[PDB]
C-alpha cells in the first residue's frame, strides 16, 4: 500500500566533482547512513567504480571496504569486492545490472549494521556483507569513465519539537500512525495528539507521564477536556528507552501498541474520522521518525 515517512536528515552534498575523485567522508558511516551518487555513463565507457576506503594511501594502497564496480562489456554486470592489505578477497558479481552506456543513474547505498544495501534508480540491486568494520571507512573514491553530478551523504537526526503536521490522508478504519522515538533520560512526560485541524478539536490525546507512570488519554472537544482514561496493564515506557508507538484506527476505537505489544484501546468520541487530519508531538522525548499508512 501507500505510506508516509517523516524524519530529519543532516545532509552533506558535493556538486560536480571531477573524476577521478578522492574525498573525505564528512562523518562516520553509522547504520542508517545513505550515500547518494548521481551521474551518467559516457557512450565510450567500459567501467567505473565507487570505492569506500580506509584512507587514501596509494603505496601501500588504502584498504577498500566496499569496491562497487559496474562494467559494460558483453551484457554488463556489477563487480563487488573488498581490498585488504593490497589483496582482493572473493569477488561478488551481480548480473541484473541497471547501468547502461549513455544513461543517467542514481546509486543509493544504505549502510546497515551487517551489510551495505544498494539500490539503483529506485529499485533494489544488491546486498554486500561487511568484511571491514564500516567505522573504518573515511574516504570515498570514484574512478573510471563516468560523469558524477553529485555525491550526497545523509545522516539521521532528531526531529525538532514541537512537531506538527497535516497527514496527507485523514484517519479512517484501517489507517495506522507510527511514532518512533526515545524517551529522554531526564524525562517527565510527552504527548502525541491526533486533531481535527480545522476545528482544533483533539480526537485522541496520548500522554504518557513517566514521573508517575500513568498513560493518560482524553479528547478535547467543544473546547474542553473530557473524562480521562488511564486503565493500563503496565506502563510501557521508561527514561532513556527507545520506543515504537503504533496507533491503529479501527471502526469503533483507536488501538495503541507500544513495542509490538497491544497496550490500550480508546473508543472514538470524535466520530468523524475523516476530519482527523493533524498530528502533534511534543514533550520530553527525542523524535526519530513518524510513519503512517
Amino acid at each position: 500500500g501507500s505510506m508516509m515517512l517523516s524524519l530529519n536528515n543532516l545532509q552533506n552534498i558535493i556538486y560536480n566533482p571531477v573524476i577521478p575523485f578522492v574525498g573525505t567522508i564528512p562523518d562516520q558511516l553509522d547504520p542508517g547512513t545513505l550515500i547518494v551518487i548521481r551521474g551518467h555513463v559516457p557512450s565510450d565507457a567500459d567501467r567505473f567504480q565507487v570505492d569506500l576506503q580506509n584512507g587514501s594511501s596509494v603505496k601501500p594502497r588504502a584498504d577498500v571496504a566496499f569496491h562497487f564496480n559496474p562494467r559494460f562489456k558483453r551484457a554488463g554486470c556489477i563487480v563487488c569486492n573488498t581490498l585488504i592489505n593490497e589483496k582482493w578477497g572473493r569477488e561478488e558479481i551481480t548480473y541484473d545490472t541497471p547501468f547502461k552506456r549513455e544513461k543517467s543513474f542514481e546509486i543509493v547505498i544504505m549502510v546497515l549494521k551487517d551489510k551495505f544495501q544498494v539500490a539503483v534508480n529506485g529499485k533494489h540491486t544488491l546486498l554486500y556483507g561487511h568484511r571491514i568494520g564500516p567505522e573504518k571507512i573515511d574516504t570515498l573514491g570514484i574512478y573510471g569513465k563516468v560523469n558524477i553530478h553529485s555525491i550526497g551523504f545523509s545522516f539521521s537526526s532528531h526531529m525538532r519539537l514541537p512537531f506538527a503536521a497535516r497527514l496527507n490522508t485523514p484517519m479512517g478504519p484501517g489507517r495506522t500512525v507510527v511514532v518512533k522515538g526515545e524517551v529522554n533520560a531526564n524525562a517527565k512526560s510527552f504527548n502525541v495528539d491526533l486533531l481535527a485541524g480545522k476545528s482544533k478539536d483533539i480526537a485522541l490525546h496520548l500522554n504518557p507521564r513517566l514521573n508517575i507512570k500513568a498513560f493518560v488519554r482524553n479528547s478535547f472537544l467543544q473546547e474542553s477536556w473530557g473524562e480521562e482514561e488511564r486503565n493500563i496493564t503496565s506502563f510501557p515506557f521508561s527514561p532513556g528507552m527507545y520506543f515504537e508507538m503504533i496507533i491503529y484506527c479501527d471502526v469503533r476505537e483507536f488501538k495503541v501498541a507500544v513495542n509490538g505489544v497491544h497496550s490500550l484501546e480508546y473508543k472514538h468520541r470524535f466520530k468523524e474520522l475523516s476530519s482527523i487530519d493533524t498530528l502533534e508531538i511534543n514533550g520530553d522525548i527525542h523524535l526519530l521518525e513518524v510513519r503512517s499508512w
Binding site: 518512533k180 513495542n259 509490538g260 497491544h262
Partner: peptide
C-alpha cells in the same frame, strides 16, 4: 516497515 518490534494489528 522499519519496526524493530512487530505490529499486533
Amino acid at each position: 516497515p522499519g519496526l524493530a518490534y512487530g505490529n499486533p494489528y
